[PDB]
Every structure is written in C-alpha cells, then in structure tokens.
Point group: none
Chain length 196, copies 2
C-alpha cells in the first residue's frame, strides 16, 4: 500500500502477546534501537531467552490501560479477540499499531543503514521468503560497515565549505566495490576530505 | 529506520509545499483513502488536476500553526527553510522531511514494482547514489518475468484459498509453485492451474 521507513531508534515498542506471531515480530525488530516490552499471561521459550539476556522486558499480565501509555509503536500479536478489542478501544487516534491497525510489517532485512524489504501484497508470502533468502545471500555484512562509511562521508562532505562541483565528485567517487571492500581506499579518502 | 506499510485510509495527511517534490510524494498516497490537504501559496498543474478531480484539498497560502494540529501524517516538501523549520510540531508526530538534509521520523525508500512484486530499498540517506545503483541492480535481476509470475501466483492463491481441502494441503500447493521453472515456463503454470481445478 504505502511503504515507508520508520524510525524506531530509541523508541518505545509494546508487544501484546507471547506466542509464535509475537516471537516473529520481536525477532524482526530487535536490531532497531529497541525499548521492547512484552505483555502476555504466558510467553514463549524464545521470548524467555531474550528476557533473560536483557534484550526485552516482560509483564505476565492481562494488558490494561496502564500498559498503553506513551508507547510509540504497539504490536498486537495475539489473536485473543477480547485483547484485540480492548487495545483498539484504549489507544489514542494517532497511535501506531500493528494488528484494523495502521502498520503492516513486510519481510525485510538490513545491513546497518542498508535495508531491503520485499512484498507481493499477500499474493505470495512464500515467494517473498525466497526472494528475502536470495537477497540476503547477495547483500552480506560487508554492506554494514560500508554504508556506515558512506554515511560518515555524506555528513562530512555536506559540512565542507567546498564547491558544489567538488562535493558531487566526492559523493560519486565512493560508490563502487573498491570502496566497499577496501579499507585503504576508505581510510585514504577520509584523509583527503579531512584536509579540506 | 525500519520498513513498514502505513495504512493512511481515513487518516488526515498534510503536504506542506506544492512543487515537484510535493507532487511526487502525493502520487505515492493518492489511491490510499486518506484525506489529503496540500498547503502552499501556489501548487502544480497536477495537484490542481487532482484537486479538480476531488482527490485532495488545497489551502492556497503559506503554512501556519493551525495547519499542524490534528494531522496524522505530515510531509514537508517545500524549499523555504523557515517553513521547514516552523514545521520542525510534537514528538510522536509522523513527519517526512522530504526536503532534507536532516530527517523526520519517516523516510521514503526507493521502490520498484514488478506487477504485484514490490521491492523497497533504503540506505537511511547514507548515499542516494548507492540506493539508485542497488535499485538498478535489483531491476536487472528481477525483470518483467516477475510481473507475469506474480499474476500467476495471485490466481493460484485465489483458487487455493477456496478449495475444500486441508490447511496443510493448501500450504504444500502454495509452496510447490515457488521456483525458477514456474516463473519461466507457461506450460508448468497452466498445467498447475488445471490441476487445482479438480479439487
């Protein structure tokens, strides 16, 4: 429908539920800057393992209005009809909520600042799974520190008091395999722009 | 940032600005069921046509405090830095700061489609040029064969959903049809359609 990038870095995420969907959702956005709370009577072995590693907070309760305060993003993973109704009746108008609801989560992966998301508008989640695998293979962890390098370069060049002509030159230069796969190449480029 | 589909159906959307960037942004959510209001002293020929077609509302003036009060999603797509700054609203407020350099909490990824297949690519603004490169590289690998194929897959989904056969049979069938040969053989496709008719 309408695909966007959403900043969750440092933001509050509540997951309502603790079964298999809940576990999937959390796996999905763990890398994202967190503040994850899970509210359910019972949770899964996986949520338990994450709770135990300091990755998540759990509240083994029936969700109440006290759980729905100032949460940036709410995920209602559960199917439990009454819980879904309750949450829907107790959130504000502009509440981001994945359930109605106003947030769908597509298959995706990231390599630091790089992200690729795939959908078929529910025609083939199984194709989407295959394409995700193929793309994860083709875009590996080298893109994590490369896109971090790119990001530093963009900020640094932006700040330069150097002509538009030169800025564009510096921004074009750093887009090839040799910048991704050579630390000398990167480090020397950084030495160059530091001098300006 | 994290990738999500935002459902704007029956939500208020404010587009601040009315140039080329505002027009491009609106195109993206024009068929989404939102109530779109566009605020700029002047607006493009295409925004005008959309207004005249009754798909959005136009406010022909510069933005003021009032315009930002009860708006679910704000897109800033102007060129006057004071408008940008002025908009730059509460926290928890969805906003796309399209006109850079700094971000809102909403970014719009590069996207291409092959029929129903959709790919979204972002580098969190690290490099618009890399994003373009990757979109071209993905365009190369996923060509127009995927446009026809997701149409096949869609029809299969429809026909399999209303089969009076088990859930586990449905899954097996929907799994079966995911490989290169289903995509690239029309015989394979057609014989499978015929097969799921018997059930």
């Amino acid at each position: 429908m309408y695909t966007v990038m959403l900043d969750l870095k440092g933001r509050s995420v509540l997951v309502v539920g603790g079964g298999t969907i809940a576990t999937r959702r959390i796996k999905g956005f763990l890398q994202e800057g967190a503040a994850i709370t899970v509210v359910a009577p019972t949770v899964s072995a996986e949520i338990n393992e994450w709770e135990a590693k300091g990755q998540l907070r759990v509240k083994r309760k029936k969700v109440g209005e006290e759980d729905l305060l100032n949460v940036f993003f709410i995920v209602v993973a559960t199917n439990d009809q009454a819980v879904n109704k309750f949450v829907k009746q107790h959130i504000k108008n502009d509440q981001l909520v994945n359930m109605d609801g106003n947030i769908q989560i597509p298959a995706q992966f990231s390599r630091g600042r790089l992200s690729l998301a795939i959908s078929t508008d529910g025609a083939s989640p199984l194709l989407t799974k295959r394409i995700k695998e193929d793309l994860s293979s083709n875009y590996d962890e080298s893109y994590t520190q490369y896109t971090q390098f790119l990001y530093e370069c963009r900020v640094l060049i932006h700040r330069l008091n150097v002509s538009k002509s030169r800025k564009h030159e510096l921004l074009t230069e750093i887009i090839d395999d040799q910048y991704r796969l050579s630390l000398v190449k990167q480090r020397e480029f950084l030495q160059q722009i530091e001098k300006y």
